[PDB]
Amino acid sequence: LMAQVFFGPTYYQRLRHMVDDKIHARARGPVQVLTRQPVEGRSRDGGLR
DNA sequence: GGATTACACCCAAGACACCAGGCACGAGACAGAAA
Secondary structure, three states, X not given: OOOOOOOOOOOOOOOOOOHHHOOOOXXXXXXXXXXXXEOOOOOOOOOXX
């Protein structure tokens, strides 16, 4: 490489936010009883606002 | 006095008519009583 590279060990930490705990998709599913709109929440297979 | 103060998303945790008191149906036990 034409440019030299800064290089060495550094202390890194893994945070709790992982993509597989955030990915969510919905085509159709449960709806609220009062308004008949998609429910809220990824855990409940909800929709996006 | 009244009304309103960004958007979206995640998760977890604790509460949601309880109750008590007066009225009914059925039953059964221990004591009455003739023999």
